[PDB]
């Protein structure tokens, strides 16, 4: 079908233009002032509002397993939520059983997504163990399946955690495949010791989750991951930046040389972790994810500052909330609570409120950190995250003045609590368009189950590897 | 006129693609892999070489031995297809008269497109009205103020606050020459009384501390008023760090290292050869710390410094010999208009610090976004001006005073072996450099007018005005 | 007289030991466990409590008709654990320093309860100021002078005047003190804030942002590093200005910072109070930071050593004296309280939290100050031959600061309601018990002026070497 | 026996005072101007020269040249006490390696000494031996390792276990901070580039791997709330890590050694293999020649606190074992004799710090940290008679021909130092008097140290109450 957006302000990461936009066959066909349109073309009046590239959520965990349970938002309900929020593409993390085949787990995830997802999607593969025969499955995943990003774990002792030797092995190998190396960075050995100590103190409430994983343990694992990456000369991507001190580590490392990228998630940019000390156990357990929200209320603004000057580059969600019934498995033991929070619907609205409405960054920067930087990093740039002739027709009409108060009483998630409850945000989407067709307009949702396509990603993204290739020949 | 570039790797600041570039009528007309062009169309084979937008030198002092023709000629040889030259009036005289004088001399001599900075050497009565004329009528959106040169060009803190507020009202880019003029004065007296008269005394009267100080004062003023500030000629680690730290906090500060400070250091002031030492004399001075050119490049790579310039101001040995007995009398300027893109490439891309995309960003694209010239300049895209360089990353160039396109006897990058230089240069749809042959037209360059309120700078300012109040 | 403290834990900046202290004729005579002494001596049982040197407040403005005179202040200082203060002499711009110093000296010698020394504030760099500075140093015994970068066309010196003053004071071997705020920029913000329609005390904080302090501080350091002299930054009030100092200390320049009890204990959210009289009580220069995270941050820097001394900047004014600027914030008199609360606030923020130990507490309340200003080991040390200015400190004695209980006539206390975990029990000054079990036994005019010698070693030993080191020269060519 | 120093300017960490010092029975008995003394006393005129406390070298590896020639060299150098590292096999007992170290030193040492015990493996049964060492044997300092994979290296969990136990014992926890797991991989990477020379040592242990391990060591200690001590700070990048932590809270102490303060690692690239091998120590000397300057500044402002030497003497023949593989070259440099002289030259003569700070970083701070103050590191009545008369003008140029070591190469070769010891008194005996050496083998005493040094543990005690 065919569609035309008249009289808008097109925002890209590089510039802004007043021009009309014409979409046909799931692509942007023309951009200009006086356009030539063929057959049955529907017209949408933009009225001077911003025309931006639909968001790319780099970090989603829609079918994440934790404590024997699956996240409450599946691929259908998850991506339904994303679209309402202005997110037109996600990259979901595939989470294999430690020891199980990556291929088998990839097909399971692909099957579930292709039948339920409302929007285009890519997949990360989380390498949960460095087992014998893992290297051949990785090669197939890069060259045949179309996956260019793999996540390794420094936390979760004796479950997901890799040693310093194993990390070195895996960074080198993935570097050879030209993959983006994602890292969940928290010291798992110290966490294990601290959880043990806190429980034995009598502290069973969700606060103990935040006390057993203070920001220092994140700062350390982040620095350790950057050190390894700089030895090997490969790009390293830090997922779920939750702390001012981990962000400072990333910042300092970018001055020194190492190719490091940082990804705060909506949670860390929106709220803080003081809610762990809530008298309401249910509410407090809804905030539980790893790494935890910082109990320092000054973190959200500090992270947004770093996102503004370029030290943090992409935003995500880390969306994997559980239902109150699900979480209450850990009523007498915080380590038994399912880790995950919401963010997928709120991500662009939240980034906007903290970064643009406050004046820290402009609308051009907002586009980079919600979609464009993500596409450059993961090798999707011309296709996704740009309003250009030839690119996919994933567009959002954004109203910088439209008010929205985030509540669990109106959110498109299955869970009872929302970590941004009562946050009054100054800037919301009006119209969201996915794959050429309108999915959200005037508060009405028209999404199709299974309509999203899997987007394959080529190895060796130039944004990351162009500097790697040069540093290889300088080294020797 | 009609031109086609086959088999080149097109390099913008955002992505790189293998495609042909098709030029006609002063603009890029088409980009694609299999371009169907008329028979007989003049074709250039790039053969895997890089196709980058021609550089934009943001800091040039050509007008104040080498004329404006020779300057843009050397620019073009080095890959710079646009300059922004600084208008320098005597303090008290009309800005309009000095602008018109510059504009005339350039329009008849410039080989490449150009814009103009106007330096506000004095905040005299009646300067506000002239500034409105320069912005709305004359197409100038950038102005430099000085904090150095006591009793000559220097503006007090009260004056600077007034100037920044008024210039914020116009939507102008405020450039700053940041050194403490009052303290430099005291340091000049002390060094002269010590018997030091040679050019080494110019570096000791202007230590990096005094630079870092004025830079910080400049940012402080800008942060209070809520206006962007642009720091010209970043020469020192300490000043650079001030800028890198202020970016993180809030204020809208931009740094411009010049080729000189990226390529060489200031140990050459201590040479036994007076004529060699004197050639390095500029303000602010090259840091005597040899670790400076790497550090600066590192900040360019991460994003703390944004644009590169040259600070080009050619003086002959005879013209420099004026200060043979007093370093404060030595004319201030170095070379670099030609070497700029070659030096930046060698220090930042050849070493591995950054890639070819960020190279384009620091040599053209960022300057365009800042001074309101994008996407007209600094991008290879349909509709943009045909200012295109066929860059060869492996082509050897040795910088010398024998082969360079200037009448000055000494080069500050003398002996520097670079790996990556221009092969073919295209300005306004026409080939001006090819196979070592220069083919430039005297007076061919057009003046480019720049609107006020560059979106890159002022969109944040606009939002901040609503928030802070 | 003659006094013996037994069973106490003597705490100096360098170590802590269990011993008894024996005082005689205002000096410490013996320290040991089995002291052989006369058997008719007055004796105080400490019971394992801390015996620390009496504090030194390096920043007071008591002589500015006031609600509290020099006597009420020094009485309050003693009760709070402070046994010596260094007051600023504030002359008229253009007038004589010698004349104003004698006026301050006269009033102080007849009112002071405790020992005292005097800072001389150079309000103007007038023709013939150099001759009087030599006199104050060589004849009167003043080694510290404050210059102002703030207050345009009143106290402010230009960059050129500062360089001139710094070089001349270096030659004298004086401690250069600096009130660092950009005067010119404050003026511009003052005009703008008032035109906005803001007349309240909140406008004081808005016209003097923390970035304007930071700037002047960096400038002051930049000048001091070039001349090679020690610079002392009074009233460090902001995170940004404390960082400038921390950084400069690593680069070379001999810079010292002085946070006051105010900036370590409370913030400036109270400027935005509905109650005008309360908000006006907080008004001082530089202002308290609206950033509530500031007092902790500064205490951290005190504890790692980037800040060295604590003062109070005490300048007492009644609610009726403040009300001069009820319709204009710039006319409000600048001054807060803290001469009585200083050591209690510093302890509660620094030692009760675990940031520093009792030993560093001694360093930051007396010893460092003494070293800097050339009063060591006369003051700031419990050692044989040192002055008998002793305090018996109980690390667990609760004290709630209120306007009802404070030793002052002022209606408002900036530390109002703050609960503290460490107080003074016994305070001894010149060998006489001046505070015991709540009882205040002071003597008006008892306090001696202390002359301070030029060229204190703690600052100028490094200067004397760097002068000889000053390498790199013009080439012969 | 009995001794009197007149006309001298006593320099302590806190003040300087012109006064005379009287020594008797190995202690300092009187300090004053006109002292009443017995008749049979030797009088030394100081002539306005500096009278400072003898140095404390906190980092020596003499038994890993013997104990006698080292403490001789130390004495000559100004250092009147060293703290030597007891290094066991990961197949030997701490109790036995201790007594083997103790018996060797007590019969050879010229100056007073204390012992560190290096915990090379966290084995089952170690906790009992440690309780013996603290309570019965007089050791309050222990060093754990994060480098040397599968030999000395402890896992993070073992560090956690170890830091906790040691904190309960009231000890000083020393860390050798380099990442062993990454070093091993970088060794291979450099060997397969065909670099076998000593320069391969510097390249296989870049500073990033030290800074990482330091930061991880600090991070652990902050969770446990114990004081942590970083030995052999060799890099700006590690030194910054330490600097930044100090202002954030954690109780961290850093010990640059004379080598990293006085020279750099450009000498690994020397054409003469024997010389470059002589510079091989771990962590390596930084190839960055800005390092020694940077490190001395950090010593000046207070971010580094004590100076050691890491003195580990190997002859050229013993170094030759790794002529074809840098990984087999024994790690050790010299510095026990030079430590004070070098520190004076780089810190005091440059004007970064004054003589008072000089005493701090050469003795006093050490004494505070390891619980030897005010017995050591202070000229005061009752304190030990370990005095040095220091001449700030006396030239000492450093050469392998002149030094008191059987090694062929000196890492401070040809450094011209202004400022050196004139007289050196140890235990109230003159052992060095302007070139004239008179030491006695075995005269040095073992000095036991108590647990819970207040300099470190006063703040821990408080932080134990506040956190929970």
mmCIF file of C-alpha atoms in Angstrom, chain C residues 139-275:
data_model
loop_
_atom_site.group_PDB
_atom_site.id
_atom_site.type_symbol
_atom_site.label_atom_id
_atom_site.label_comp_id
_atom_site.label_asym_id
_atom_site.label_seq_id
_atom_site.Cartn_x
_atom_site.Cartn_y
_atom_site.Cartn_z
ATOM 1 C CA UNK C 139 56.770 44.894 62.931
ATOM 2 C CA UNK C 140 53.150 43.914 63.735
ATOM 3 C CA UNK C 141 53.365 40.152 63.072
ATOM 4 C CA UNK C 142 50.915 39.507 60.240
ATOM 5 C CA UNK C 143 51.828 36.820 57.651
ATOM 6 C CA UNK C 144 48.452 36.568 55.873
ATOM 7 C CA UNK C 145 46.640 38.968 53.535
ATOM 8 C CA UNK C 146 43.422 38.471 51.529
ATOM 9 C CA UNK C 147 42.793 39.918 48.073
ATOM 10 C CA UNK C 148 39.385 40.094 46.357
ATOM 11 C CA UNK C 149 38.434 39.126 42.813
ATOM 12 C CA UNK C 150 34.790 39.832 43.564
ATOM 13 C CA UNK C 151 32.868 43.047 44.320
ATOM 14 C CA UNK C 152 33.391 45.199 41.208
ATOM 15 C CA UNK C 153 34.755 48.751 41.776
ATOM 16 C CA UNK C 154 34.740 48.185 45.557
ATOM 17 C CA UNK C 155 37.260 45.485 46.551
ATOM 18 C CA UNK C 156 38.031 43.849 43.165
ATOM 19 C CA UNK C 157 41.551 43.733 41.714
ATOM 20 C CA UNK C 158 42.291 43.328 38.004
ATOM 21 C CA UNK C 159 44.400 40.488 36.600
ATOM 22 C CA UNK C 160 47.298 42.952 36.453
ATOM 23 C CA UNK C 161 46.845 44.128 40.047
ATOM 24 C CA UNK C 162 46.658 40.500 41.270
ATOM 25 C CA UNK C 163 49.952 39.589 39.569
ATOM 26 C CA UNK C 164 51.482 42.710 41.117
ATOM 27 C CA UNK C 165 50.111 41.860 44.586
ATOM 28 C CA UNK C 166 51.005 38.150 44.412
ATOM 29 C CA UNK C 167 54.611 38.931 43.398
ATOM 30 C CA UNK C 168 55.032 41.485 46.187
ATOM 31 C CA UNK C 169 53.494 39.246 48.837
ATOM 32 C CA UNK C 170 55.694 36.358 47.700
ATOM 33 C CA UNK C 171 58.705 38.623 48.328
ATOM 34 C CA UNK C 172 57.436 39.294 51.833
ATOM 35 C CA UNK C 173 56.911 35.575 52.516
ATOM 36 C CA UNK C 174 53.204 36.043 53.195
ATOM 37 C CA UNK C 175 50.280 33.607 52.782
ATOM 38 C CA UNK C 176 48.204 34.969 49.866
ATOM 39 C CA UNK C 177 44.459 34.546 50.626
ATOM 40 C CA UNK C 178 41.891 34.956 47.887
ATOM 41 C CA UNK C 179 38.166 35.538 47.849
ATOM 42 C CA UNK C 180 37.646 34.012 44.428
ATOM 43 C CA UNK C 181 34.501 34.989 42.504
ATOM 44 C CA UNK C 182 34.290 36.770 39.141
ATOM 45 C CA UNK C 183 33.209 40.282 40.104
ATOM 46 C CA UNK C 184 32.429 41.503 36.591
ATOM 47 C CA UNK C 185 30.208 38.539 35.764
ATOM 48 C CA UNK C 186 28.437 38.728 39.130
ATOM 49 C CA UNK C 187 27.593 42.353 38.295
ATOM 50 C CA UNK C 188 26.075 41.325 35.000
ATOM 51 C CA UNK C 189 23.992 38.591 36.609
ATOM 52 C CA UNK C 190 22.959 40.896 39.458
ATOM 53 C CA UNK C 191 21.505 43.405 36.951
ATOM 54 C CA UNK C 192 19.726 40.612 35.023
ATOM 55 C CA UNK C 193 18.252 38.833 38.059
ATOM 56 C CA UNK C 194 16.818 42.091 39.495
ATOM 57 C CA UNK C 195 15.284 43.068 36.158
ATOM 58 C CA UNK C 196 13.582 39.633 36.183
ATOM 59 C CA UNK C 197 11.686 40.846 39.244
ATOM 60 C CA UNK C 198 13.557 38.685 41.749
ATOM 61 C CA UNK C 199 14.295 40.563 44.998
ATOM 62 C CA UNK C 200 14.465 37.674 47.473
ATOM 63 C CA UNK C 201 17.542 35.992 48.950
ATOM 64 C CA UNK C 202 17.232 33.213 46.319
ATOM 65 C CA UNK C 203 18.414 35.872 43.886
ATOM 66 C CA UNK C 204 21.749 36.026 45.720
ATOM 67 C CA UNK C 205 22.429 32.391 44.805
ATOM 68 C CA UNK C 206 21.266 32.944 41.227
ATOM 69 C CA UNK C 207 23.502 35.988 40.746
ATOM 70 C CA UNK C 208 26.548 34.069 42.063
ATOM 71 C CA UNK C 209 26.449 30.579 40.460
ATOM 72 C CA UNK C 210 29.100 28.016 41.346
ATOM 73 C CA UNK C 211 30.691 28.357 37.903
ATOM 74 C CA UNK C 212 31.770 31.942 38.756
ATOM 75 C CA UNK C 213 33.612 30.800 41.815
ATOM 76 C CA UNK C 214 35.264 27.934 39.890
ATOM 77 C CA UNK C 215 36.421 30.396 37.268
ATOM 78 C CA UNK C 216 38.054 32.854 39.663
ATOM 79 C CA UNK C 217 39.651 30.035 41.610
ATOM 80 C CA UNK C 218 41.264 28.614 38.421
ATOM 81 C CA UNK C 219 42.394 32.127 37.504
ATOM 82 C CA UNK C 220 43.899 32.693 40.950
ATOM 83 C CA UNK C 221 45.785 29.397 40.691
ATOM 84 C CA UNK C 222 46.927 30.179 37.130
ATOM 85 C CA UNK C 223 48.504 33.442 38.374
ATOM 86 C CA UNK C 224 50.047 31.837 41.450
ATOM 87 C CA UNK C 225 51.598 29.042 39.437
ATOM 88 C CA UNK C 226 53.252 31.513 37.101
ATOM 89 C CA UNK C 227 54.768 33.608 39.889
ATOM 90 C CA UNK C 228 55.538 30.479 41.881
ATOM 91 C CA UNK C 229 53.829 31.401 45.148
ATOM 92 C CA UNK C 230 51.441 29.634 47.524
ATOM 93 C CA UNK C 231 47.792 30.594 47.005
ATOM 94 C CA UNK C 232 45.029 30.020 49.561
ATOM 95 C CA UNK C 233 41.420 29.828 48.429
ATOM 96 C CA UNK C 234 39.089 30.917 51.189
ATOM 97 C CA UNK C 235 35.492 29.751 51.478
ATOM 98 C CA UNK C 236 35.415 26.825 49.093
ATOM 99 C CA UNK C 237 31.654 26.436 48.605
ATOM 100 C CA UNK C 238 31.142 24.352 45.452
ATOM 101 C CA UNK C 239 31.951 20.942 43.914
ATOM 102 C CA UNK C 240 33.285 22.571 40.729
ATOM 103 C CA UNK C 241 35.682 24.882 42.630
ATOM 104 C CA UNK C 242 36.953 22.034 44.803
ATOM 105 C CA UNK C 243 37.782 19.980 41.681
ATOM 106 C CA UNK C 244 39.845 22.836 40.188
ATOM 107 C CA UNK C 245 41.963 22.773 43.343
ATOM 108 C CA UNK C 246 42.248 18.986 43.526
ATOM 109 C CA UNK C 247 43.478 18.978 39.893
ATOM 110 C CA UNK C 248 45.943 21.846 40.326
ATOM 111 C CA UNK C 249 47.529 20.153 43.339
ATOM 112 C CA UNK C 250 48.576 17.264 41.070
ATOM 113 C CA UNK C 251 50.063 19.552 38.400
ATOM 114 C CA UNK C 252 52.465 21.547 40.558
ATOM 115 C CA UNK C 253 51.049 24.851 41.987
ATOM 116 C CA UNK C 254 50.997 25.104 45.779
ATOM 117 C CA UNK C 255 47.256 25.615 46.258
ATOM 118 C CA UNK C 256 45.358 25.228 49.558
ATOM 119 C CA UNK C 257 41.607 25.170 49.932
ATOM 120 C CA UNK C 258 39.469 26.160 52.879
ATOM 121 C CA UNK C 259 35.880 24.832 52.998
ATOM 122 C CA UNK C 260 33.905 26.399 55.798
ATOM 123 C CA UNK C 261 31.590 24.599 58.279
ATOM 124 C CA UNK C 262 28.583 26.008 56.358
ATOM 125 C CA UNK C 263 29.511 24.389 53.022
ATOM 126 C CA UNK C 264 30.336 21.057 54.735
ATOM 127 C CA UNK C 265 27.188 20.937 56.867
ATOM 128 C CA UNK C 266 24.202 22.378 55.012
ATOM 129 C CA UNK C 267 23.351 23.289 51.403
ATOM 130 C CA UNK C 268 21.590 26.292 49.912
ATOM 131 C CA UNK C 269 18.118 24.908 49.220
ATOM 132 C CA UNK C 270 17.096 27.113 52.159
ATOM 133 C CA UNK C 271 17.462 30.251 50.025
ATOM 134 C CA UNK C 272 14.199 29.189 48.393
ATOM 135 C CA UNK C 273 12.347 29.179 51.695
ATOM 136 C CA UNK C 274 8.971 30.853 52.076
ATOM 137 C CA UNK C 275 10.272 32.456 55.298
#
